[PDB]
């Protein structure tokens, strides 16, 4: 029987095969496989015996050439820097992951006892017989806990794991061959982008240093030297991707800046002494509207109930507690201030001490008040919040629809390119969790409302019915030119301004509009149909090519529901399936911005809008234009 199972596959007789198959039926690791599959395996499965404990089946770093089932005895799973991470016993199988992913072995397998017996299936046989059938989740284990869960979604991809095991996984599977540059970077991108949620720099940077200096615990001197050299090239590659993701954001992180400076010293010393890193060392040497930074300082007015104010000077990323303390420095108080945002319509929100970088989250005409709690209900808005009382039609009427739309789109591109991809993550998971600003995202989001309220403001301040018909016409044209420049954000902002209750009320104005522009507008409006998850908008944006500005409210909605719809941790493990979903949404933005976009009076106008954002005021004005 062992004789039979020792015979080369091609030397097994029909009755050998039959006898083998009947025995395969008593093996629990094959129990979920079909009859068809098990008779194929009868001709291909190898019996392997080894006498001595401490015998090595395979080593970490090697190519995956076999899948094994333990028949008798036990084995240690051994990992450089951790020793024996677990032990497998009679009935367990191992070695499938490397085979299927065409990845290096992530562990050595060492016989734990004398006289162990194995069933082994080699690679080409595994791939023809078992690849889409041996579909068990891969569950890597350390000290009797799951540490990495991978599944077929064709390779096994990471579904969940610990931060450390996920890092170890993404490090090891880096391919250094130049022909694979883009593929390797793509694979690393989810980790490099999303680690801030589950493995912040305080933990990641020491982990990277530890990995950089890792040494194998097995092999000849040359083998050990080569392993550790490629390990270091892999760590360097990851650091390069990590550094590139942050760009200028690294200055906000002292830990990360200190790590990278010291890492550069390590690599240049090692490059010299080991004569290595010829390509990677110069890459690393490089690294060692303009965007607002969290450490930039703001001069900000904070109001009292009597409408006097204090001017504070604090970092953009200051918390509400830091704002309160700065205000108290200047008012010389110990009388329990709260910070309240106040809208032009008198709507008030108390901020939490916890809230960070609140300055850019005010509405268009919002202000910040500091007051004792007893004053909350008596606060009243400032005249400056209430917006203009005279139109600007006389200015922009004399500007071409095309020039306006173009200058709008140019300014919109400066604002959109100022937003770092990481701000989308910080905004979604909550700013206080990172103590980072999303100032650039905040100001770009506010632009949508500014444009929208610009439309409503100018229509509602236009007393003459005739000129008001010409306004409606001109905005419809401005929108059409925005959509032509692929600025879908500012296009929907104008269309939605036109849809505002205060503007749609004006039958005498709409009735009088040439039905050419009535049809243009009715179509724009249908593009906003929320039906079947904004299918009309979705397909529209889908047809377009890279240099485009998407409909930003729907992007924020997508991100919100990705975060709320999905748990960050599953059984105390990072839910990496969620991480990829978030990272995909942010790479959509990267794609929109992957190609560049190709009259000082028009420029100045478009960039200095003054707007009414008090809906009550606008409706009152509307009602007296057309009762």
């Amino acid at each position: 029987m062992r004789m039979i199972l020792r015979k080369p596959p091609g030397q097994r007789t029909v009755d050998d095969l039959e006898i083998i198959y009947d025995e395969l039926l008593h093996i629990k690791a094959l129990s979920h496989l079909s009859t068809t599959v098990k008779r194929e395996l009868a001709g291909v499965l190898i019996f392997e015996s080894h006498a001595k404990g401490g015998t090595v089946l395979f080593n970490q770093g090697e190519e995956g050439t076999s899948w094994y089932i333990i028949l008798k005895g036990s084995v240690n799973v051994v990992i450089y820097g951790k020793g024996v991470v677990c032990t497998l016993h009679e009935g367990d199988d191992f070695g499938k992951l490397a085979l299927v992913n065409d990845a290096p072995r992530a562990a050595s397998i060492v016989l734990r006892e004398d006289n162990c017996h194995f069933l082994r299936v080699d690679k080409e046989d595994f791939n023809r017989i078992l690849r889409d059938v041996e579909a068990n989740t891969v569950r890597l284990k350390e000290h009797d806990q799951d540490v990495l869960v991978l599944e077929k979604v064709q390779k096994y991809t990471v579904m969940s794991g610990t931060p450390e095991k996920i890092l170890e996984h993404f490090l090891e599977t880096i391919r250094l061959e130049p022909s694979l540059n883009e593929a390797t970077d793509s694979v690393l991108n989810d980790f490099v982008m999303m680690h801030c949620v589950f493995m912040p720099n305080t933990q990641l940077c020491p982990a990277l240093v530890a990995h950089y200096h890792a040494q194998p615990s097995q092999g000849t001197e040359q083998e050990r030297m080569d392993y550790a050299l490629n390990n270091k090239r892999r760590v360097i590659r990851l650091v390069l991707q990590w550094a590139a993701m942050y760009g200028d954001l690294l200055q906000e992180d002292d830990v990360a800046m200190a790590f990278l400076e010291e890492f550069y010293v390590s690599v240049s010393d090692d490059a010299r002494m080991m004569a290595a890193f010829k390509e990677q060392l110069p890459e690393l040497e490089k690294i060692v509207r303009q965007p607002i930074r969290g450490s930039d300082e703001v001069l900000f007015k904070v109001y009292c109930i009597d409408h006097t104010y204090t001017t504070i000077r604090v970092p953009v990323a200051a918390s509400v507690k830091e704002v309160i303390s700065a205000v108290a420095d200047k008012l010389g108080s110990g009388e329990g201030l709260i910070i309240v945002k106040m809208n032009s319509g008198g709507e008030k929100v108390v901020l939490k001490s916890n809230d960070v970088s609140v300055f850019t989250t005010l509405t268009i005409n919002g202000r910040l008040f500091a007051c004792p709690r007893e004053q909350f209900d008596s606060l009243t808005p400032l005249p400056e919040q209430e917006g203009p009382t005279t139109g600007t039609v006389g200015t922009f009427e004399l500007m071409s629809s095309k020039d306006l739309a173009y200058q709008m789109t140019t300014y919109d591109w400066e604002l959109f390119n100022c937003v770092h991809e990481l701000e989308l993550i910080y905004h979604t998971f909550g700013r206080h969790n990172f103590k980072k600003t999303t100032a650039n995202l905040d100001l770009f989001l506010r632009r949508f409302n500014e444009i929208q309220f610009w439309v409503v403001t100018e229509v509602c301040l236009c007393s003459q019915l005739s000129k008001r018909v010409q306004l409606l016409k001109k905005f419809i044209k401005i929108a059409a030119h925005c959509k032509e420049y692929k600025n879908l954000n500012s296009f929907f902002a104008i269309v939605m301004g036109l849809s505002n209750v205060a503007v749609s009320r004006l039958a005498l104005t709409w009735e009088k509009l040439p039905s050419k522009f009535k049809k243009f507008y009715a179509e724009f409006e249908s593009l906003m149909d929320p039906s079947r998850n904004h299918r009309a908008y979705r397909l529209t944006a889908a047809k377009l090519e890279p240099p485009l500005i998407p409909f930003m409210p729907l992007l924020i909605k997508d991100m919100t529901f990705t975060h709320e719809g999905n748990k960050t941790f599953i059984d105390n493990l990072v839910n990496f399936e969620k991480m990829r979903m978030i990272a995909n949404t942010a790479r959509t933005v990267r794609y929109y911005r992957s190609q560049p976009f190709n009259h000082q009076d028009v420029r100045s106008y478009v960039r200095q809008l003054n707007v009414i954002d008090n809906q009550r005021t606008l409706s009152q004005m509307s009602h007296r234009l057309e009762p």
């Binding site: 902002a493 939605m496 929320p530 998850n533 997508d558 529901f561 719809g565 969620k578």
Partner: protein, 150 residues
């Protein structure tokens, strides 16, 4: 074909209610980017138009009010402020579609956590009423059932 709208301030539990109704949290992954993300067959096909995440974009809620046939006004019974935020949304609904009556329900969400409670059943009752919990899945389906009945 139906179109129900979820309204209320932030941090109330609108998105949780929406996902817990259309699919369920944790039993399945939730992809908000596909044609059927907010559609559920219930015998009627409902779309849930939810303002979670887009509260700062007032044009978004107006667009949904225009398309919405039923309305959920949600507050957190752990928050004062959110309850008081409710009068205005009710009013804005009557303005966008130019009507007199619209089917709707008042929802006191987060009812499971009562050591943090500051609003009472009474206040919401004074103010269709339901005390629900998206996470504890109390009254999730009921909310949207009532609105097809209205």
């Amino acid at each position: 074909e139906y179109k129900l709208v979820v309204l209320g301030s932030g941090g109330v539990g609108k998105s949780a209610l929406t996902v817990q109704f259309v699919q369920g949290i944790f039993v399945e992954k939730y992809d908000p980017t596909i044609e059927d993300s907010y559609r559920k067959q219930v015998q009627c096909m409902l779309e849930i138009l939810d303002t979670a995440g887009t509260e700062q974009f007032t044009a978004m809620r107006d667009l949904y009010m225009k398309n919405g046939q039923g309305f959920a006004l949600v507050y957190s019974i752990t928050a004062q402020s959110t309850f008081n935020d409710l009068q205005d949304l009710r009013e804005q609904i009557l303005r966008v579609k130019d009507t007199d009556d619209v089917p709707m329900i008042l929802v006191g969400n987060k009812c499971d956590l009562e050591d943090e409670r500051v609003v009472g059943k009474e206040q919401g009752q004074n103010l269709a009423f339901l005390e629900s919990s998206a996470k504890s899945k109390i009254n999730v389906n009921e909310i949207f059932y009532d609105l097809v009945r209205q």
